[PDB]
Amino acid sequence: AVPPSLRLPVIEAAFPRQLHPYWPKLQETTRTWLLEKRLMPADKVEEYADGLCYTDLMAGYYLGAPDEVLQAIADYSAWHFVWDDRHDRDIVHGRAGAWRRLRGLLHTALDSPGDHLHHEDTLVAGFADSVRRLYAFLPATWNARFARHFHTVIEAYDREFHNRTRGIVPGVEEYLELRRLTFAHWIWTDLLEPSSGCELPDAVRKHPAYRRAALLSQEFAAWYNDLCSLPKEIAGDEVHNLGISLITHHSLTLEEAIGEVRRRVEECITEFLAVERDALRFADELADGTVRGKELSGAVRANVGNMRNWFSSVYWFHHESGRYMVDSWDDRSTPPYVNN
Ligand SMILES: CC[N+](CC)(CC)Cc1ccccc1
Ligand SMILES: O=P([O-])([O-])O
Ligand SMILES: [Mg+2]
Ligand SMILES: [Mg+2]
Ligand SMILES: [Mg+2]
């Protein structure tokens, strides 16, 4: 029962949700990883980890992924949620120095994860572990692309630190550009490829239909998160949210802003449906009677399929995850699962 202001009938009707068969073991294994990597307090893992639905989110996304690939992705993704929490806490505590140091360590670990597997900062060591494993699936050219994209993500998180420390709410267009980095659009897009077991040639993944399908999948996800995470974000003095940018700089009321975000979210869906058709047509063109062509076709098809799955996985994640249930918290400004 999704609340009216959050409900999207098109997703519920035309985007049936999927579940990777490895999910039952995935949920257990990632939880054990969080504990052993000491990324969250043991009591908070016990009480909140399963209810956070982080593994569910990934298992509803990267369908067809080899089990060990899904495991590395799930561990990374859970880590990223914890990083977002650490980032938030450093901000509210004014820990500029601690953040700067972490920021610098993540950059270095990104290029040389093996060196950071046992760093004193458990967050850094956990990052390096998931990254080292992700670097073991595809050629070095894919690893370099992943690294390049993530360096940009880290710097986007630093810009967020800058903004919140100074009390700046980004303009609408400024936010939209920034959001493609803080949501890590291109990381999720990169991870499509190890999931289907094929590093795509540039001419394939930069095909206008593949590019646009990939973009719309991520825009929907980020903006829908903005819609659903808005209550807890307002309560927690978060400034990064399309709704917040609209209220601040466009003189919109909360109701009007929510409506504007909804419309932009809804447009992603129908625009995706159009481009999805073009992307699948491209997939057909790739199937040229050669083994290589069959391979590229199957990969693009699997990838576009997962771009579609992201819609439904993200939609239901926000309904199920304990991460956004601010009304159930003792202190609305302080989520119970974060280390304060
Ligand atoms: C902060 C959480 N996350 C993923 C770890 C960072 C990019 C974005 C996200 C939120 C909600 C659903 C999906 C992704
Ligand atoms: O980053 P990119 O390679 O363009 O995707
Ligand atoms: Mg964030
Ligand atoms: Mg956040
Ligand atoms: Mg959010």
Q: Which two tokens stand for residue 82?
A: 């914890």
Query: Domain spans of the chain?
Result: 1-340
Q: Which residue has the least CA distance to atom 10 on ligand 1?
A: 225
Method: X-ray
Cα–Cα distance between 37 and 53 in angstroms, integer? 18
Q: Give the domain 1-340 fold.
A: Farnesyl Diphosphate Synthase (1.10.600)
Which atom belonging to ligand 1 lies closest to the Cα atom of 184? Answer: 7
Which atom belonging to ligand 1 lies closest to the Cα atom of 84? Answer: 1
Q: Closest Cα to residue 251, out of 172, 175, 177? A: 172
Q: HSE (CB half, 13 Å, CA atoms) of 252?
A: 18
Residues with CB under 6 A from ligand 1: 57, 77, 80-81, 84, 183-184, 221, 225, 314, 317
Q: Which residue has the least CA distance to atom 4 on ligand 2?
A: 206
**Residue-wise burial string across 267-304, b where 16 or more C-beta atoms lie within 10 A, e elsewhere:** ebbebbeebbebbbebbeebeeeeeeeeebbbbbbbbb
For ligand 2, the distance from its centroid to the CA atom of residue 165, given in whole angstroms, is: 31
Cα–Cα distance between 54 and 78 in angstroms, integer? 6
Residue 27 and residue 325 in contact, taking contact as beta carbons nearer than 8 Å = no
Distant-in-sequence, close-in-space partners of 273: CB < 8 Å, separation ≥ 6: 14
How many Å separate Cα 226 from the centre of its chain? 12
For ligand 2, the distance from its centroid to the CA atom of residue 146, given in whole angstroms, is: 9
Cα–Cα distance between 191 and 171 in angstroms, integer? 30
